[PDB]
Structures are given as C-alpha cells and as structure tokens.
Amino acid sequence: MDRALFLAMSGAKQNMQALQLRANNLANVSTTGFRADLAQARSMQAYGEGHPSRVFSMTERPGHNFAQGSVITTGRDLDVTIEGSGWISVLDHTGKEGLTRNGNLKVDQNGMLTNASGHLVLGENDAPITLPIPLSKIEIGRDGTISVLPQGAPAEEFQAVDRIKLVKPNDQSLFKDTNGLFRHKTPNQPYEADATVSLQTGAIEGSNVNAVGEMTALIDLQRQFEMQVKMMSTAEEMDKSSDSLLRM
Amino acid sequence: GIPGALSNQPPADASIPQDVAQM
Amino acid sequence: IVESDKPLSAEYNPDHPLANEEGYIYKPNVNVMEEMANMISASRAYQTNVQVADSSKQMLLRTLQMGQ
Amino acid sequence: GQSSQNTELPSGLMLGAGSKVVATQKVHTHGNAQTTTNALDMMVEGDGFFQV
Amino acid sequence: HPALWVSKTGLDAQQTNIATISNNLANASTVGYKKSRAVFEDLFYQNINQ
Amino acid sequence: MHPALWVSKTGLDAQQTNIATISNNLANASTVGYKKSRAVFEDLFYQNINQPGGQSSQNTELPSGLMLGAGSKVVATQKVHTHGNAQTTTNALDMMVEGDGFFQVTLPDGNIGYTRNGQFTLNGEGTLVTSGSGYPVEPEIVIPEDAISITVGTDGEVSVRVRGQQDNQVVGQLTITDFVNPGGLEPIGQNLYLPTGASGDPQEGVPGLDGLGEIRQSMLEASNVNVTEELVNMIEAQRVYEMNSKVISSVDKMMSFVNQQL
Amino acid sequence: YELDYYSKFGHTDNYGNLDLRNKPYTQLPSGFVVKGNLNISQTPIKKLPKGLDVGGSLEATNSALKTIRSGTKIKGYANLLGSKIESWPRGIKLGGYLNLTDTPLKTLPAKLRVKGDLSVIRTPISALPEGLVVDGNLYIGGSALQVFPDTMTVKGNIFLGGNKITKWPSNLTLGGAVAP
C-alpha cells in the first residue's frame, strides 16, 4: 500500500537468506577442507522519477575465508594437508576438473588414488593417478611426489610413480561450485600445477569456520530482521488509519 | 535548491569513458 | 534527500575482500535509536493529519447544509 | 543453474544444504604387541589376515 | 577451534616420545641394543590477516 | 551492526590469536632449538564522531571532541630469540651454538635456511645432513668410510680419526650465520628460518671470530619456552575472552529490549 | 588545516571515495593518491599538491580551488563550476570534461586536449589557445571571447551562448553545428 511494506519485507527476506548462509558454516565446522562462506549486504537504489528515498538491500557471497584450516594429526600415510595456500586438483563424477582441499586420500580396488568424497586426484600427466595394484608401502612426498614399494620388494626400491598436482591460483578468481569444488570464474582456464605448494603428510586440514564470527553475525541478523518487521507493522497501521478519508 | 541533495539518477562514474566524458 | 554527515563506522575486517590498506571496512552510519524514533514520529504525525482532514471534511459538509 | 555470471553479486548467491557423515573410515594402523604365555594365540606383524 | 588441534599435536607428539622411552627402558638388558631418541620439529607457520 | 558489537569482537579475535600462539609454544616445549613467540596487541584507530572536521585538539575534553576506538588487534607474533639451556647427549653428530649464530642447511628449492637445531646425522653417502627431513648442511662435509670417530672443534673444524696414521685429518669446517635482526626471520617449520627484508642480509663467518658463537659437539640447545609463563598468560587470555563475551550479550539484550518495547 | 594519514581515513568509504564536502581542510599531502572520486567542493583549499593521482572524478564546485600543480592525473572528469581558479596548468592528465562555468579563468595552455565537453561559461578568458582540440561540445556563453583560434577541433556542437564571433577558424572539423 505504501511500498514501504515491501521495502521492509525485501530486507527481512534477505536477512533470512544471510542467516541460512551462516547456518551452513556452523553445520560444516568439522568438514574437511571446508572454506567458510562470507556474507554481506549490498545497497541497490531504485533509480527513477521522484525523491531518492527507496533503496533495497540484498545479500550476496562476496568470497570465502581462504585461511588455513585446523590441522588434525592422524599419523596416516594417505592423509595430507596443504601447507599455507594451495589446492589439490580433482575431477568429480562429471569428469570436470575442480580444486579441492580435502587430502583424506584412499586407494580403491583398482588402485586409483581418490579422496574421501570419491573425486579422482590428478597428477603430473593431468590424468587421474593410478598406482600398481599389489603395493606394500605408500609414502606421499612433501612436494606431492608419490613413491610406492612393490609387494615383497626390498627396502631399497622406493621408486616414484606420480606427483600430486598442486595448484595455487589467486584466491579472488575462484568460486565455490555446486559440489564444493572451487573453479576459475573465467571458464576454459587451465589450472597450472605449481611446484611451490607443500604437503604436510600425516595430517588432515579441518575447516576454518570462526564460530564466534558466525554467532555475532546471527545476533545482528536477528535484530535487523525484527526491526524491519516492525516497519511492516507500522506500514499497515498507517494504511488502516488513512482509510477514514473515504468513510463519509 | 538544497545543497548536497542526492539525485535520483545513476551516479555518473569512471569506467566506460562514456560517463567520464559526457557532461 | 540529504545524507547524514556522521562518519562511516569503520570496522576491522582485514581478511575481507574490500578491506583497505589497514584492514578496515566502512559501514553505513545508520543509528538504530534515531531511526526507530523516526518510525514512531512519522507514523503518529501521519495519522494526526488524517484526523484533521477528516474533521475538515465534516466542516465543509455542514456548510452545505446551512440554511436548510 | 546459470554458469558463473556474477557469482559475487546477489544474483549469484548460493546456499548449501548442510553437512553429512559420508563414511566411517577404518584406519588400519598397526597396533602394539601383547606378549602372553598362551601357546595358541598368535599375531601377524604387518599386512595380512587370518582366514576362518 | 585451531588451538584445540595445535595442542592435540603436542599430546600426540609427546606420546610418540614416551613410546620410545619405554622401548629403551624395556630393552635395558638386551645385548647389542642401541638406544633411540625422538626428534621434535615444529609444523608449518601460517600467515594471518595481512 | 551496532559498532559496540564489532569492537568487542576484535577483542575476541585478538585473544584467539593469543591462544593460538600460546598453544603452539607449549606444543613445542621439547623441540630442540625452538624459540617462543608472544602475541603483541595494539589498539585500533580512534574516530571523531561529533566533529567530522578531524581536529582532535580543539575541544577534546568536550562532547564535540569525543573519539571512540575501534577495538584491538594482534600486530605481530614476536619471536624471543634468547639463548636456551644446554642438553648434554652422547651422540657425536649433534651440535650446539654458544651464543649468537645460525646453522646453514640447503633446502630442496636451492636457497638455504637457517636453524638453531643442531640435531644432525649422516646419509648413505656420508654427508652431514639434518636428523629430520635430511637436508644437507652448508658447507658439505663428507665423512670417509675408514673414519672411526668425528671431532668437531670449537671453530667448526671437522676432523676424523683414521687408524694407521696419527693426527686427525681435517675434512671440513663448519660456518654459521648471524643476522642484525634475527627476530625478523620467517619461520617455515621443520626448525628452519628463511631470511627476510626485516632480518637483514646474512652475515657469514667462522664460528668463533667476529663475535660469533662456538660450535659445541655432543650438545643440544633446549627450547627457551617458559611453561609457567604460558600458563599465566593462558589464564589472562581466557578471562579477557570471557569479558568480551559478556558485553556482546549485553549489547544483544539491550537491542532486543528496543524492538520488544518500542 | 592539513590532511594527515588518519585525517583522510575518516572520509573514505569501501571503494576509496574521498568526501571533503565543506570540511575545513586547506591542503592535501604531497604526492597524494586517491583510489576513487575526490570531492573538495566548498573547501578553503587554495592549491592541489603536486603529484596528485585520482582514480575517479574531481568535484570542486563553489570552492576556493585556485591553483593546480602540473602532473596531476584524473581518470574521470574535473568539475570546477564556481571555483576560484585563474589559470590552467599544462600537463594535466584528464580523462573527462573540464567544467569551468562561473570561474575567473583567464588563460589556457596551448595545444590543450579535452576528451569531453569544455565549459568556459561566464569566464573572463580572452582567447582560446591555438591547437585546442575538444572531443565534445564547446560552451562559451557569457564569456569574453570574441575571436576564435585559427585551428581548433570540436567534435561536438559549438554553443556561442550570445557572444558575437567576429573571426572563425580556418581549419575546423565540426561534427555538429553552431548555436547562438
């Protein structure tokens, strides 16, 4: 009726969306290699004839928290965590290359090296890494080199077979896709395998969700949500009062 | 008129020479 | 419409993409307490002007009925 | 699902559906040794399993 | 919480040290046994808000 | 947000960094040649609210000249490069530096990293390498197979004893590096430091001349962490952390009252 | 007074737009760099510091801006409607228009290039410099101009604004027309 009902409704609806965005981070505190999503609000003015008094606010995801996660020491050979900044190249079920930070690796019955989510890990050849089937000792190098020991072979047979593809692009050019894999915003952009990133083998990288940061965002989203609801109530209260004009 | 009053039109800006030049 | 001249509230969000050289981001200078007072004041001022117009509407009608 | 196209803007806002436990992974690290006097309890040093 | 797992590394690191100490004390009468020492080193240092 | 909420949050993040750097020190309480770190706090900038002109000396004692802070932050994790105590071991391949000086090892990428850790050993070829990842020590020191003992002098002069001939044959000489500002060195883990701009150029020289330290054989440098200092600072960090939580809830209750009463 | 490191921090938004509207500042730091738009309208600033680099637009309407030092770089436009400037320096990197309406401007540097419109409305300027090239419209209404330069390039329409033109350029490539 006054268009301030919808101006406040559109703000209250967006505050719920930001609340859900923060809720996903808290639901994913223990997730491995999880980058917390950032939430903010953007002011978009309604340009047109009349006084510039109506400005909408909509929530967006400007970026992600690319800080180093909490490293968990597991003493497992097939667990690796990226030191500092970096990524691991994996292809999902669609055969589409995407960057990940989950270094919880495993070997299937055929020998292909996958991660906890089943994404095949790429290597030097840019093809999924395949290991000889009857292994005896698998050690992951600090730079990503994979050295294996054939079954029954003596100690002095630690030959390298593959090198884990570690990619360190600009963090501002990466977006989180629909399946948690970060990809270039510009499509058809090759992932250059960096040789500077290092793996801290024997440990797993946790999530970087700042629990306090989400909680203080929640309490501010609640108060701003409630204040706009009062604006909706006072908008209809004014409308009801301004109805006796035609009540002759 | 009042000084410093906001305008109801997009704010001519920098990128896209189009605005930086046309008055 | 004239914007308030209060300084923007600077917040320390150094990891934010929009942070400046010192890690500060700036946010609107909207103060909750004064905006709530405007919500109360504008609504009560709006409703009392309807009362005057409604009362003034009656006075015109009684002038029409004057004399008969 | 319009590919890319202003992911940082309100049009490209993406909200996740939460989290789940995907697998209870078995960690087959070699344990310690228990030296007992029984003559029928036996241990495998390394990889290998008894078959029953 | 990062401090939870930084200390958890210290708990695990000291556990490895104690396991070697017990092994040295267990073989205090073994003929031709060489004692062993656990080497400690700190993990990577991460860069924070720049 | 209400500016009082984020002011208190910066105090919470400042203490979280303090807790992180204080748990790392206690984790490395037995690491050989480990230098403790302390979190250094400094207050954020003050902004003039009642006088946007930016003149903070006009009526500073008046409401017009009021200035409100933006919270606190951890400005640096300063390394305290004090000398540690001496551990006397039986191994002949571990060394120590008496006073100022840093050992030199060659990293896989080519550049050298400086360390206080003296836990060394030999590889299959016999070169002196680190006891951990195995990075060789600069300059290279190769021990002959016929050698029966290793003697490292106070000036790093490495000599071995070989039977069939008297006098020890010298097979190398250690050399240590000192820095003008060792606190500016970048820790990279694995008991290694990388030179930075704030540290200054490396100053290399024989271990025992020009103010450098002396190499001690069969001796190790203990970590300089003070476990009691960490526990005391841990106590303060918790209480300051709790206090900033109280005010955040206090602001939340006040704002909840506003939209519930009005 | 002057502008310090922290004085400017209170007048900057998330996109580096410096707003000094009616602020009692008299000068800016030497070698000043502003990421976004700069607004110094209605300010007592008499001279811009040398080496000023603006990533946006310049607005100094109704201000005391009188002197500009050479080498200044402006990505957007320079709006100086109603300032106190008397002479325009040579070598200014300007990517927009130069609005000098209601200014005491008298002289312009030779071979000046304006990438947009040029307004010298109500100015005591006596003669446009030879080699002046304008990629937009020309406004000379209410000015003291009565003689045009021999060669000038106005990509837009020249607006006379009332003053009588006694001499026309010999080499003039005009994309529009001439209006009184």
From TrEMBL, chain A:
GO CC terms in record: bacterial-type flagellum basal body, rod
Annotated keywords: Bacterial flagellum, Cell projection, Cilium, Flagellum
A single GO BP: bacterial-type flagellum-dependent swarming motility
Annotated localization: Bacterial flagellum basal body
Principal cellular location given in the protein's record: other
Subunit structure: The basal body constitutes a major portion of the flagellar organelle and consists of five rings (E,L,P,S, and M) mounted on a central rod. The rod consists of about 26 subunits of FlgG in the distal portion, and FlgB, FlgC and FlgF are thought to build up the proximal portion of the rod with about 6 subunits each.
Official protein name in the record: Flagellar basal-body rod protein FlgF
Organism encoding this protein: Vibrio alginolyticus
UniProtKB/TrEMBL annotation, chain B:
UniProt gene name: fliF
Homology family: Belongs to the FliF family.
Full protein: residues contained: 334 to 356 of 580
Self-association and partners: The basal body constitutes a major portion of the flagellar organelle and consists of four rings (L,P,S, and M) mounted on a central rod. The M ring is integral to the inner membrane of the cell and may be connected to the flagellar rod via the S ring. The S (supramembrane ring) lies just distal to the M ring. The L and P rings lie in the outer membrane and the periplasmic space, respectively.
Described function: The M ring may be actively involved in energy transduction.
Record protein name field: Flagellar M-ring protein
Subcellular location: Bacterial flagellum basal body; Cell membrane
Automatic annotation (TrEMBL), chain C:
GO cellular component labels: bacterial-type flagellum basal body, rod
Superkingdom of the organism of origin: Bacteria
GO BP, one annotated term: bacterial-type flagellum-dependent swarming motility
Residue ranges of domain Flagellar basal-body/hook protein C-terminal in the record: 22-66
Keywords: Bacterial flagellum, Cell projection, Cilium, Flagellum
Locations listed in the record: Bacterial flagellum basal body
Family the UniProt entry places it in: Belongs to the flagella basal body rod proteins family.
Assembly and oligomerization: The basal body constitutes a major portion of the flagellar organelle and consists of four rings (L,P,S, and M) mounted on a central rod. The rod consists of about 26 subunits of FlgG in the distal portion, and FlgB, FlgC and FlgF are thought to build up the proximal portion of the rod with about 6 subunits each.
Protein name: Flagellar basal-body rod protein FlgC
Native organism: Vibrio alginolyticus
Gene behind the chain: flgC
Shown residues in whole-protein numbering: 70 to 137 of 137
TrEMBL record, chain E:
Subunit relationships: The basal body constitutes a major portion of the flagellar organelle and consists of four rings (L,P,S, and M) mounted on a central rod. The rod consists of about 26 subunits of FlgG in the distal portion, and FlgB, FlgC and FlgF are thought to build up the proximal portion of the rod with about 6 subunits each.
Flagellar basal body rod protein N-terminal domain ranges (all copies): 7-34
Full-protein interval shown: 2 to 51 of 262
Protein's UniProt name: Flagellar basal-body rod protein FlgG
Coiled coil segments of this chain: none
Recorded name of the encoding gene: flgG
Domain of life where this protein originates: Bacteria
Location of this chain's protein in the cell: Bacterial flagellum basal body
Family: Belongs to the flagella basal body rod proteins family.
